[PDB]
Write a protein that binds this DNA or RNA. Sequence first.
DNA 1: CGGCAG
DNA 2: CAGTGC
DNA 3: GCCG
DNA 4: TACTG
Length: 331
Amino acid sequence: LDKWVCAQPSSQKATNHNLHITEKLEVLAKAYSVQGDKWRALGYAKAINALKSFHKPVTSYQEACSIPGIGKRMAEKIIEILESGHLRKLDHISESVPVLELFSNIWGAGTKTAQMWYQQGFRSLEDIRSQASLTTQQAIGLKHYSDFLERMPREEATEIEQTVQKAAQAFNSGLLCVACGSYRRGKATCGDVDVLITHPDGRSHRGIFSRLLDSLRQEGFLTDDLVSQEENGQQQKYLGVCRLPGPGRRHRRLDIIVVPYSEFACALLYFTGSAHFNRSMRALAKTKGMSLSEHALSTAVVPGRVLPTPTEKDVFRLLGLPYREPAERDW
DNA sequence: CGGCAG
DNA sequence: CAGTGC
DNA sequence: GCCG
DNA sequence: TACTG
Ligand SMILES: O=c1ccn([C@H]2C[C@H](O)[C@@H](COP(=O)(O)NP(=O)(O)OP(=O)(O)O)O2)c(=O)[nH]1
Ligand SMILES: [Cl-]
Ligand SMILES: [Cl-]
Ligand SMILES: [Cl-]
Ligand SMILES: [Cl-]
Ligand SMILES: [Mg+2]
Ligand SMILES: [Mg+2]
Ligand code: NA
Ligand code: NA
């Protein structure tokens, strides 16, 4: 369990004894990510968490290699920074990376789109606005480019959650609404608000998006939709943009999912995160012949068995993990 | 050598 | 499906 | 990038 | 893992 971040409190990272190392590695990791080398970036992300949580300053090649998530190549970089204070590869990152970062921060444009735009000769958001072909989503992303990069005070996330909850409970008073993501992990600021909705009777959650969305639109609260499949009635999620009433308010990202009560624990676990916490826990489940989704914990296929998970604590227990409160899942 | 969450 | 984001 |  | 196109 030394080797599984989901087995450890994320508060281990609050005493990073290797900042001069991890601040340099983070630059490389972001360069690989925006260029599309996702697996190399993932290795970097895991090495950075390992270094942030290590109990002391790493001082030797041998000590570094012993750390899970750190191998020979990462160790060599560590000892280059220890000895010289610098990491030479930082001076040799593709010059396209700033522009690729600029472009892939458009919601709906990832690395493939950003690289295409870069190859077409675009270098600024002015170039994108006037010359790029944009999807409906990307055009909304561009319109809200600064908004979507800003994080809101958690107090504002509460007001957003309460807006959604009151609209939902107006037409069914038994609905349960919970803000998840970084809000539930206790962060001071939130990139968006992640609202989970269910009904304890097991069945009244069905067909509420149409009524909820109409209610939120009648108020003027929703200002743009990113993902909202409203035509076939099987809608699990809404992704969009809202703005609280009155002066001094910014457009804020809002994600909503509705789930049947029988799946509450796994959905709450998924939506609280963090993302790397989830991937660790899911990877841990797989090694044990299980599978963890936002819907259920189940055994491996042939159709597997669905394991009983009435609360989040049961998922931890079934994977042999000590329980972590949301604030300790912030990997 | 291949996965790396689902 | 590939690409994208949660 | 790292891991088994 | 659920959307788009
Ligand atoms: O790749 C992902 C992204 C998110 N998730 C889950 C965990 C995450 O906390 C939750 C909400 O996604 P967000 O993008 O909103 N991330 P988070 O709320 O943790 O941080 P913030 O919204 O403040 O950036 O969905 C994943 O499982 N995998
Ligand atoms: Cl009612
Ligand atoms: Cl892990
Ligand atoms: Cl079995
Ligand atoms: Cl629970
Ligand atoms: Mg969030
Ligand atoms: Mg979100
Ligand atoms: Na190691
Ligand atoms: Na993007």
